[PDB]
Assembly symmetry: C5
Amino acid sequence: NLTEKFLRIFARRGKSIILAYDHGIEHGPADFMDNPDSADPEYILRLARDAGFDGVVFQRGIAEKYYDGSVPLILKLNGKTTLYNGEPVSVANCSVEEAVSLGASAVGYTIYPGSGFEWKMFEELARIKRDAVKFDLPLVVWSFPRGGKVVNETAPEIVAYAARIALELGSDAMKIKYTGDPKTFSWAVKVAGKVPVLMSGGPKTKTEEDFLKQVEGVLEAGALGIAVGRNVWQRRDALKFARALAELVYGGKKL
Amino acid sequence: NLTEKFLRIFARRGKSIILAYDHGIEHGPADFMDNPDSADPEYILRLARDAGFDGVVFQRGIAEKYYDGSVPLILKLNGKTTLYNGEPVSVANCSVEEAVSLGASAVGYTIYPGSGFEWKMFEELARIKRDAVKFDLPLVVWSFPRGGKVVNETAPEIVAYAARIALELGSDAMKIKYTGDPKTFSWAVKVAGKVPVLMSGGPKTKTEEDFLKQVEGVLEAGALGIAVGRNVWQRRDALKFARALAELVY
Amino acid sequence: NLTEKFLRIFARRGKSIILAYDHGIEHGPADFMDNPDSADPEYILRLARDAGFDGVVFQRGIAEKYYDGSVPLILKLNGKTTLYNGEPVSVANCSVEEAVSLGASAVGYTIYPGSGFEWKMFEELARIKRDAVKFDLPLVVWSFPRGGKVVNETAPEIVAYAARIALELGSDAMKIKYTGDPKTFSWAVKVAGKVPVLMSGGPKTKTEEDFLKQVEGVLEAGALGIAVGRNVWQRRDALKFARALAELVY
Amino acid sequence: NLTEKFLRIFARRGKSIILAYDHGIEHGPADFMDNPDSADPEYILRLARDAGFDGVVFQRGIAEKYYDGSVPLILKLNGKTTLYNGEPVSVANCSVEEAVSLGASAVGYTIYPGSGFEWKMFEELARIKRDAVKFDLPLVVWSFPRGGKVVNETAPEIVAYAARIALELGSDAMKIKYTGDPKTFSWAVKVAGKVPVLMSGGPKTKTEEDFLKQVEGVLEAGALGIAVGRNVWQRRDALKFARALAELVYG
Amino acid sequence: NLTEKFLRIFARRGKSIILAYDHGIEHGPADFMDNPDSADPEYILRLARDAGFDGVVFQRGIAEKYYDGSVPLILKLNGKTTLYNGEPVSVANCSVEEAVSLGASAVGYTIYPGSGFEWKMFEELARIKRDAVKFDLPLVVWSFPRGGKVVNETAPEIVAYAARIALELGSDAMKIKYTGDPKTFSWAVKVAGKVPVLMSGGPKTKTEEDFLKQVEGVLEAGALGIAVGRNVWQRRDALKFARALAELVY
Ligand SMILES: *[C@@](O)(COP(=O)(O)O)[C@@H](O)[C@H](O)[C@H](O)COP(=O)(O)O
Ligand SMILES: *[C@@](O)(COP(=O)(O)O)[C@@H](O)[C@H](O)[C@H](O)COP(=O)(O)O
Ligand SMILES: *[C@@](O)(COP(=O)(O)O)[C@@H](O)[C@H](O)[C@H](O)COP(=O)(O)O
Ligand SMILES: *[C@@](O)(COP(=O)(O)O)[C@@H](O)[C@H](O)[C@H](O)COP(=O)(O)O
Ligand SMILES: *[C@@](O)(COP(=O)(O)O)[C@@H](O)[C@H](O)[C@H](O)COP(=O)(O)O
């Protein structure tokens, strides 16, 4: 059971915080100017360690050149850029077998349900899923409806759809966008059934409190925890704030 | 003879009811709000068993996480979403070999004849068909003409075309839309020949009576049975009504 | 030599009549309304056998469920529908190896020279040709230019082009549309060289005499014979007229 | 060295004449009406043999039904039609391995640099080049820029680009369009470096002398010779003219 | 560690100059009219040697016919032409295995982030990267964002994105456009992390002084060196200028 393996490794305390760092490809280095140290993957590793987080997410080139075994690794297999203008598509730049050699404990893959290319991502995910089972690595799906009829990616019915698709396609854990409230987000958590849900952190919030309140909602809705990037490492007080998130998520008490 | 195998497993009583549950990918969870328990695959398995139905239809993720061997399984290999706006296409997210591993007794695959992508699904069905034969699992084709010249999907000449295409491409059973009346639907059944036909249940009908009436015509047209989702599990009295369907069909 | 093999099997008398029956996918069951018995592949086989024809053409599904070894079989590997609106393209739904297992004595494949997808069909035909040689099964190509700059499919220069292309790509026999007269048709036969040409029967003619006259022209042009569907089995006197065709051709 | 092998087989006399016959697919049989025997591949083989030419170019269907080993064969692996209206593309209908079994002494492949589909041909040529090396058959590239920014295919800078691309991609010999004069054609020959250049014959010229003058310019430019189709087999005096071409190129 | 192997071979003095010569395909022979000896690859090899440069970049055809082992070789695996009008795309015409056989000490590949085809190059670079590791050849990525939203290829944010993408995808060294000043270029150098950066030379500058100032700024920004073509071999005094470059860099 790969969900069980995922939980043992990335959620030993009953909840999970994953430090996300595929941003160098997805958005590029404009994400790193706020807190320049954030451009250094070594800083990101020390940050995940010192904050007591469960994992990091790296693309293959970052894992190859920097990964040191110090925090469990989710190797994000596919990536695209924001420079790209077509219907959304993100293709694997790494195999599951290569992810094993690079020290990963899980693999990650983004799908964009609704895209004119949804078929292209589903077809490749099928091959990656088969390899995840073969190599006994949990498959984590970033499920981000985009393109086609999608006009509001955080609408309740869009996020619930995102969650259900990830279940249906064989994910062992998933990452979806937050709806902005616990009632509608708990519907997504429910339809995902036995597969645990991680909240995608999103653009840096106006205040730290705004983020903490979102995280409380996610936990209220019954999600497993968060896969957070900017709302930690785009902050000059990254470590102090990361520590406050750890206490909220692992501590389990009402703000 | 994989048709014979299909009949032995899924129509031991001479007729067949299959509980369809690929909707979580095809339509998403809005389908589940009318009767919230329907979002739980375990509730679906209990419903199929408790009504004495012949099979269930699951995508790979649902089968992997929930399938317990209690009712025969058709593993639906391809899925698409309603969020998608292109020429209709649905590609495999699972192989026949993996379906075998997940405990499937048959595999399912949707084609959309007429789509700008009709060639992509025919190409893929060729490989899936070859594998179905290799692993001795019946191949059940959902034949749903869509895109291209198709305007009315339930028009009698489209449904009959759907039936013929499924026969021609090598299906061992098929699922097609109802035309709304037994005489026109019996032509589709006729052109399917040796291959048994299941009626796609469709959107929940205004009254329970309306649906029973449709199932009556389906059987009268000589079809094998029904592959039904919403018209059972979107109802709050799902189990009671499923038992009434079992009484009618068998 | 696979042309020689094709002639021994399908032209033992020196000329050939092939009963074509891929219509179920290509046009759908509308083709069967004229003579409803034609929806039944058992009736088609009986018809070919009774009239003394040389072969039958089935898609894989029909061959698998109905072929009984009674008449030599050309397995038509690719198929498309009339519901489809893009640039013309027909992909294989069956392999040469599978066709051999289905009892085929030859394999068939349609190309649409000129189509925006001509590259896709030429690519796939290369694989099929390779397998046809490997399995020693003659390759029969339906060469039907369509799409691109093709305005009139029965223009003398289009049909001759269709014939040359089938020869160049490595067909062992070919099926092409008739130009309407023997003089221009004989140019198409000439440019096909050593590869025998079968006339595509086309839409059912206004009279049985019209068709007989076309067939007479085809023979005068030096063609091997005919691959006929509708002009036989769309007729209520199917057997009688098939026998008059045997008379004329043999 | 496959260029050296190509030269030994197809240019033993120092220059080369190859009789090209892929027209039946590229242009269709209207090319054959002027001289109806030209529709008969047996006639083409006899023509090349009787004129003393170095080779013939056939698509797989023609080689399979007709090739008799009598003249060295270049197996033209890809073909497209003039009925096709999309971005110029021509895909292989035959593998290198099959070409070997059909008697080929070399393989041929057309690319259309500039096409919206140039990537599809480069990707395929890569596989064919790998197989050519594997089976030790020289690879002859018809480098015909077409589509994209290409307007006049015989413009000096286009023909030179065609020549250089064929060198860069790994051709062992190449066939390109003539610019219409020896000075500009010689720059194309130079940028091709160690790879020998054959002139594509083109549409039948107004007079025989017109074509002879073009050939003289091609030879003046330092090209290896000509890959000629229509300017021979479209003529009712095909063999007579073929022998005059042999005298010019080999004398 | 393929970056350390790249550095040992192509940067033994601590900084690198690579003589780039993929122009014959990328731009065609118009690049060669200024200094026509530049059309001869033997002239190019002698130049690199005489100038004391670290390496040369050839496409497979040039390497196969001309490479003599005299200077270390980066085999540039993909190439496209300026004649092409679609969304930028450049596919492999050579495999890593073949590059090994041709005497390559490294392999090169261009990506165009932002292109409507960026996915096609990412998919292919993945197979190339896997082979580079298997054959122990460093992978050098030319990262040139182009198409999509890209309007100024030398903008600070675009060149930094270029650099970071090359690091993310697995390059062992990279080649990127210069931003025109050392401050903005050093940010691209920093985001590349452990992966060394080479400056793409670009079109021939108005004066020798102009190019020298740019090279000075490239070094000031902490880059490894330059991969230069036109700014050396388009000049009549190619060798004199090449040695002035060697004096500055080393
Ligand atoms: C990237 O942020 C890309 O997401 P989109 O910008 O395309 O919506 C994600 O793949 C991250 O892995 C994930 O969202 C967590 O990072 P964040 O900074 O949002 O917390
Ligand atoms: C889904 O209903 C999808 O069908 P369309 O909405 O694309 O026409 C089918 O794949 C079902 O498996 C089948 O129709 C039976 O379920 P229903 O709820 O229609 O009875
Ligand atoms: C189908 O008739 C399809 O032909 P098109 O409608 O696309 O032109 C052919 O593949 C038949 O196999 C062949 O033409 C012979 O049948 P016919 O009914 O025309 O005699
Ligand atoms: C065909 O002529 C096709 O060329 P395009 O009409 O597409 O330019 C070539 O492949 C010939 O092999 C070559 O041009 C030699 O024949 P020609 O008749 O031109 O002398
Ligand atoms: C070619 O110059 C292609 O570059 P673009 O014209 O597409 O931007 C490069 O691949 C060169 O290899 C590299 O830029 C070095 O050559 P240069 O002449 O620019 O110094």
